[PDB]
Amino acid sequence: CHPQNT
Amino acid sequence: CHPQNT
Amino acid sequence: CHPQNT
Amino acid sequence: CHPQNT
Amino acid sequence: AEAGITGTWYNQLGSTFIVTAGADGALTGTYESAVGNAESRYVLTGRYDSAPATDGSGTALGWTVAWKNNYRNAHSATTWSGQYVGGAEARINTQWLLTSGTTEANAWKSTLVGHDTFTKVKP
Amino acid sequence: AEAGITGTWYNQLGSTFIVTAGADGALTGTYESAVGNAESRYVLTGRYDSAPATDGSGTALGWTVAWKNNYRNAHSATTWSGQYVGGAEARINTQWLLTSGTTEANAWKSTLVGHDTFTKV
Amino acid sequence: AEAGITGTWYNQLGSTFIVTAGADGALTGTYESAVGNAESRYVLTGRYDSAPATDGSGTALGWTVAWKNNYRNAHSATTWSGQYVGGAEARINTQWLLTSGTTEANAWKSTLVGHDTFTKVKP
Amino acid sequence: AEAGITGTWYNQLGSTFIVTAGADGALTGTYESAVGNAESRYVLTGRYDSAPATDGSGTALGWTVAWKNNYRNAHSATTWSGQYVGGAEARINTQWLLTSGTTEANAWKSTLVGHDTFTKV
Numbered sequence: 001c002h003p004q005n006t
Numbered sequence: 007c008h009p010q011n012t
Numbered sequence: 013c014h015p016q017n018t
Numbered sequence: 019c020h021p022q023n024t
Numbered sequence: 025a026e027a028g029i030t031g032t033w034y035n036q037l038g039s040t041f042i043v044t045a046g047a048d049g050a051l052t053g054t055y056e057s058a059v060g061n062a063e064s065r066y067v068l069t070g071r072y073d074s075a076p077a078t079d080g081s082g083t084a085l086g087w088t089v090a091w092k093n094n095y096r097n098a099h100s101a102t103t104w105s106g107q108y109v110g111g112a113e114a115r116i117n118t119q120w121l122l123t124s125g126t127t128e129a130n131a132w133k134s135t136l137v138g139h140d141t142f143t144k145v146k147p
Numbered sequence: 148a149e150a151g152i153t154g155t156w157y158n159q160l161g162s163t164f165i166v167t168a169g170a171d172g173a174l175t176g177t178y179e180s181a182v183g184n185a186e187s188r189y190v191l192t193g194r195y196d197s198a199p200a201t202d203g204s205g206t207a208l209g210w211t212v213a214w215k216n217n218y219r220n221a222h223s224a225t226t227w228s229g230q231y232v233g234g235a236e237a238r239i240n241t242q243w244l245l246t247s248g249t250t251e252a253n254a255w256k257s258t259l260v261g262h263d264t265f266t267k268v
Numbered sequence: 269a270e271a272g273i274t275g276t277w278y279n280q281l282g283s284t285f286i287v288t289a290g291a292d293g294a295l296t297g298t299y300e301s302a303v304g305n306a307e308s309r310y311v312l313t314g315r316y317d318s319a320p321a322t323d324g325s326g327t328a329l330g331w332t333v334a335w336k337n338n339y340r341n342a343h344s345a346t347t348w349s350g351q352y353v354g355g356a357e358a359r360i361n362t363q364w365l366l367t368s369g370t371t372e373a374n375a376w377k378s379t380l381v382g383h384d385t386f387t388k389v390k391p
Numbered sequence: 392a393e394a395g396i397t398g399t400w401y402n403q404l405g406s407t408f409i410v411t412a413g414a415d416g417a418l419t420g421t422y423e424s425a426v427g428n429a430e431s432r433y434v435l436t437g438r439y440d441s442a443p444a445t446d447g448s449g450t451a452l453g454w455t456v457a458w459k460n461n462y463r464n465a466h467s468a469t470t471w472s473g474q475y476v477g478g479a480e481a482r483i484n485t486q487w488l489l490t491s492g493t494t495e496a497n498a499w500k501s502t503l504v505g506h507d508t509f510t511k512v
Binding site: 293294311312313314315316317318319320321323324325326327328329330331332333334335336341343344345346347348349350351353361362363364365366367368369370371372375378379381 | 416417418434435436437438439440441442443444446447448449450451452453454455456457458459464466467468469470471472473474476484486487488489490491492493494495498501502504
């Protein structure tokens with residue numbers, strides 16, 4: 001889960 | 007004026 | 013593997 | 019001319 | 025499912041896209057801007073995934089238009105790549121790349137990138 | 148120039164793209180990955196400018212490949228957009244967009260972007 | 269005009285962007301996703317045009333975030349490039365590029381592209 | 392690897408990019424076009440991963456240049472996103488987005504996309 005988006 | 011968009 | 017390259 | 023290249 | 029893609033679609037700027045999806049994965053149709061009329065019409069050809077994953081996953085597709093018809097020639101081509109999402113309000117979400125024919129010296133600035141959303145209006 | 152597009156081209160990773168350019172703007176052919184086993188082949192369709200400018204300009208073109216054939220279905224499609232340049236050393240310079248079919252939640256990370264240069268060697 | 273850009277902005281997915289525009293063209297601040305909390309916070313640095321054209325023309329700007337802070341390291345960086353449009357409802361419209369560190373063999377698929385719209389909520 | 396980023400790099404069109412990489416992730420420096428007359432120079436700022444992965448991975452990085460200095464103002468900004476690869480022949484491989492300030496009507500054609508490879512030669 002990349003922190004840019006949820 | 008390109009025909010893709012107005 | 014994705015078919016696009018190699 | 020755009021400053022980015024040449 | 026080919027039937028859901030087939031129809032008349034429109035994007036946020038008022039351009040018209042008429043497409044038919046064939047059972048072998050082919051896409052064919054015409055593209056037009058908001059001025060309407062006969063020619064602003066250009067031929068389009070593309071491909072889509074005729075056997076998509078189940079889930080609530082979208083169907084991947086893509087199509088190209090070379091901006092030349094029998095009235096004008098802008099010396100450029102656009103490709104849209106995105107996904108069809110069916111449901112109450114079906115939408116095609118895309119990203120596109122517009123490339124113009126340039127001399128070698130201006131080739132570094134030949135391509136524009138952007139994004140389009142199409143809403144369906146008719147089969 | 149114009150018809151010089153018809154032929155067999157290779158990108159920098161060994162993928163082969165075989166195309167037929169129609170007098171009025173159609174592009175038709177097959178694309179296959181390196182290794183080259185006979186179904187690693189996929190169908191492609193596209194368009195190109197059939198009447199390019201007479202100054203030293205390249206020829207605008209583009210095509211699509213949906214990544215499904217009789218053996219595999221990768222639930223994705225790639226579009227390449229660029230221009231053809233004829234000469235003693237002909238090439239097709241492109242940038243591409245690879246979209247995958249995703250759920251609504253993963254829509255933001257659905258598309259990859261890249262570039263390829265195709266030559267006849 | 270630096271004052272209009274400075275503030276707290278949010279995008280359509282619920283991520284937070286806090287920025288200050290300095291008079292020499294510098295942009296500094298922090299970026300956070302919708303989970304909120306302390307760390308989901310990463311440092312951002314960018315530049316904007318401090319002397320824009322008059323008209324109803326937008327102001328061009330861009331900023332970068334490397335996705336590493338003191339709690340996580342995703343080994344990737346994102347750059348957003350777009351324009352600030354002021355008025356009743358000010359908006360920043362952008363396009364972004366996310367690149368991950370990969371080995372040479374997977375470098376052809378290292379970069380994602382997309383687009384974001386930010387709406388302002390506070391100075 | 393890591394600090395190897397600090398130095399003077401050149402892209403394929405002769406533009407020079409001089410950068411200082413800070414221990415904690417900052418990137419600072421100047422960019423100047425070919426011809427190289429002393430204001431063709433613009434300020435750049437950015438970030439890079441200061442603790443990269445130990446397998447054979449490249450180092451993720453990115454930076455911005457707003458096209459205004461004391462002499463010219465082109466009402467545009469360029470962001471480059473990519474990765475650094477160290478070796479006997481070091482390079483930084485990137486793709487970039489050039490946005491121009493436009494009116495609402497021309498917003499759809501505001502951004503160009505391209506790619507650049509920077510080397511120390």
